[PDB]
Amino acid sequence: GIQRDDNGRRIWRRRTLTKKDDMLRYKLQRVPFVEEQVRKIKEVGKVMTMDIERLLLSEDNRFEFVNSVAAEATEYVEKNRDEYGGTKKAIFHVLSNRVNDLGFDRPEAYAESDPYKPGPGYLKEYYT
């Protein structure tokens, strides 16, 4: 059990994977060309879609989850009436908070600006 050398320090067997794992070499690689996809997903809003499902994974009844979200969203707007009207939505703020409560990081209410917007009067036309 306990083993020490002359200096008095403790020497222990470094537990290491003796055998070899096939899947280890087949899964550590990452694709290099998803920069446009990840940017599109965030801009579209599918990042919340995964978060919405993730919350439902730890839930027992999806009808109770939406009632709890609606109840908490109503609580948010009552406290701060002049915050959840435009770029920030009461429901999205609840969802962002509930994800942040799990220990992950999301922007507040999933709100995103347009860094490339030229002027105040220029609104982004959508290419249908």
Add this chain to the structure above:
Amino acid sequence: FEDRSYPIDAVFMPVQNANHSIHSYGNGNEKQEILFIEIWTNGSLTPKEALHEA
């Protein structure tokens, strides 16, 4: 020809991938377009350099 030299079918792309996107902004009658260029290079030249060479 054939002198025990084994040919290598080498692809000569230093730019692994490229893509462009268009953002259109309107101000009632000021239709200006914004062009986004997206460049992936294999390190043989920086994407800024590939933009100039192209």
